[PDB]
């Protein structure tokens, strides 16, 4: 490790494991459906996903 | 008690005597010790242990299971004379995977933790069904030969042999790997039985002893000429081996002159108690450089399996055959029945390998068994079936008694 500015590992240390939010970014969907015109099987499937 | 001495083995195979410490703990010692093995390969001119990524470095058993870092060495079950390994052993921390929507999830996980079926099994499977339909076909056309004993059994017969023995043939000679070659002995197996009772089946008259003997003579060779030639599945050739020549021998004289079966049979009892002494000796004679004594030494242990179970089958055919419930002195059998089966339950604990331990034991056991069941469907009465389930229930239960108490 180095502390001359571009290593951004430098005075971080490591704790354990745990959860992480990782590099993707979603997109909302387009022309969502209204709540009473949504169909349930792609409705609770898009939502857990 | 100080310190014990043991080989520590290393890298590719060097194995190092060490003289180590009996009372510190042994995740003192790994550090040090690798240093020394390393030193050593250095000075041999070989090339030293190194590290791959993340891992650690750990001191095992021969058998790779890893000593208790905190425990000493003396508190674990290593004496002077030992062995133990010192190894790299990688990390496993890695992400954990998850599906949520369940139809896809069960489809993905299912497909890794079991084996579909596949070109190279349904092969195996096709050879299985024919070898199985053959023998029921040999069966039915050696029934009809009981109310008609015509050329019709043989003729028909003899054919079916001829064409499943010329199909094995091309097998063989193409076979090109042991996938192939399983294939080709499941097929060769099953042309035996076809040409046995089809060679029987040819002397006219009533079926019996004089027929009898073509039988099991053509079997004796077949079988013997099978192995000569294949050099494969020794056990369940020379099983057959033993018990076609044997019967043979007490086919030809029943059929010249025999006084009573209890003779034959007494002396079929005799030959194999003699055969069964000698055991060892014959599988001993019957069976880079390194490799010479691999072969032999497993070539040796399939002669003697399949001997000593060969053997357990006419004692126990014939013991069953000997005793009985209403002839002459009924206790005389039955005691020496029990004399017979202490000698085998007592030396079947000088054999070393599993099966033929296991296969000696279990052969006294059937033995006690089936006379018991003798002695109660004949000769039957409330108080015989009665005491019979009785001494048949406890009989093995004090046999696993007295090893898991």
């Keep these: 490790r180095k502390p001359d500015g571009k290593d951004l590992n430098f005075g971080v240390v490591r704790v354990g494991v745990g959860m992480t939010r990782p590099e993707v970014t979603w997109g909302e969907p387009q022309n969502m459906p209204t709540d009473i015109e949504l169909e349930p099987v792609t409705g609770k499937a898009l939502q857990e996903f | ?405």
Excluded at chain 2, 214 to 229: N, P
Excluded at chain 2, 242 to 259: D, E, F, N, P
Excluded at chain 2, 341 to 354: A, E, H, K, T
């Design chain 2, 1 to 405: 008690p100080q310190a014990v001495v043991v080989g520590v083995m290393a890298g590719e195979g060097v194995q190092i005597g060490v003289l180590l410490d009996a009372n510190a703990p042994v995740s003192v010692m790994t550090d040090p010790l690798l240093k020394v093995v390393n030193s050593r390969l250095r000075e041999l001119g070989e090339a030293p242990l190194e590290a791959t990524g993340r891992g650690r470095w750990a001191l095992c058993l021969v058998d790779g299971a890893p000593l208790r870092a905190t425990q000493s060495l003396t508190e674990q079950d290593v004496y002077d004379g030992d062995r133990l390994w010192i190894r790299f052993i990688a990390d496993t921390e890695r992400r954990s995977q998850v599906i949520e929507h369940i139809s896809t999830a069960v489809a993905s996980d299912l497909s890794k933790r079991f084996a579909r079926i596949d070109p190279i099994v349904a092969v195996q499977v096709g050879a299985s069904m024919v070898a199985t339909g053959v023998v029921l076909a040999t069966g039915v056309l050696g029934w009809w030969r009981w109310h008609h004993n015509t050329w019709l059994t043989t003729i028909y017969t003899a054919v079916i042999g001829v064409l499943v023995l010329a199909v094995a043939m091309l097998l063989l000679m193409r076979a090109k790997t042991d996938a192939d070659r399983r294939v080709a002995d499941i097929m060769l197996m099953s042309a035996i039985m076809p040409v046995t009772v089809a060679a029987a089946a040819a002397p006219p008259g009533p079926v019996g002893s004089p027929q009898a003997v073509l039988g099991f003579g053509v079997l004796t060779v077949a079988a013997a000429l099978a192995l000569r030639f294949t050099g494969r599945r020794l056990g369940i050739y020379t099983t057959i081996v033993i018990i076609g020549a044997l019967t043979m021998l007490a086919a030809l004289a029943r059929m010249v002159a025999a006084t009573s079966a209890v003779t034959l049979l007494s002396s079929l009892l005799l030959i194999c108690v003699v055969a069964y002494h000698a055991a060892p000796a014959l599988s001993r004679r019957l069976a880079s450089s390194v490799r010479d004594v691999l072969l032999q030494a497993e070539r040796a242990r399939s002669f003697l399996s399949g001997l000593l179970t060969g053997l357990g089958v006419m004692v126990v055919v014939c013991m069953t055959s000997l005793c009985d419930p209403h002839t002459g002195q009924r206790w005389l059998p039955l005691i020496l029945a029990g004399f017979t089966s202490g000698f085998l339950l007592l030396r079947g604990r000088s054999y070393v390998d599993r099966w033929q331990s296991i296969t000696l034991a279990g052969t006294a056991v059937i033995i006690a068994a089936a006379v018991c069941v003798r002695y109660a469907l004949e000769l039957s009465s409330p108080l015989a079936v009665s005491i019979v389930a009785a001494i048949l229930v406890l009989l093995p239960a004090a046999g696993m008694a007295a090893a898991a108490h």
